Design a protein around this ligand. Structure first.
Ligand SMILES: *[C@@H]1O[C@H](CO)[C@@H](O)[C@H](O)[C@H]1NC(C)=O
Lengths: 49, 48
């Protein structure tokens, strides 16, 4: 008999930054509109889709 | 004079079939209908 909220699990967006593959192969990733101290623990739990 | 509007990045699967594998599968039967929507929303953000 207590009150509990319901929230989005982790609805955001992934954008990939990358120079031309004719130049290099390194890639840096974005995580749209999410505090990524939350994904840093998430990769530890490997719960990232 | 307005110069820009709020940029939107709606997503097909997450909007239509919230975390439902069967729903996403039946959406795949609709072809690339919504990739057009994603591209158009990227476009509107770019023009803003
Ligand atoms: C998001 O930013 C940091 C990093 O997580 C932290 O202060 C908190 O989680 C969030 N802060 C705000 C103001 O939403």
């Amino acid at each position: 008999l207590e009150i509990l909220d319901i929230t989005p699990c982790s609805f955001g967006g992934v954008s990939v930054i990358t120079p031309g593959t004719n130049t290099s192969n390194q890639v840096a990733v974005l995580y749209q509109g999410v505090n990524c101290t939350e994904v840093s623990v998430a990769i530890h739990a490997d719960q990232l889709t | 004079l307005p110069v820009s509007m709020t940029k939107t990045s709606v997503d097909c699967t997450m909007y239509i079939c919230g975390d439902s594998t069967e729903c996403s599968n039946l959406l795949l039967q609709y072809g690339s209908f919504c990739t057009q929507l994603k591209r158009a929303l990227t476009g509107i953000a770019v023009e803003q």
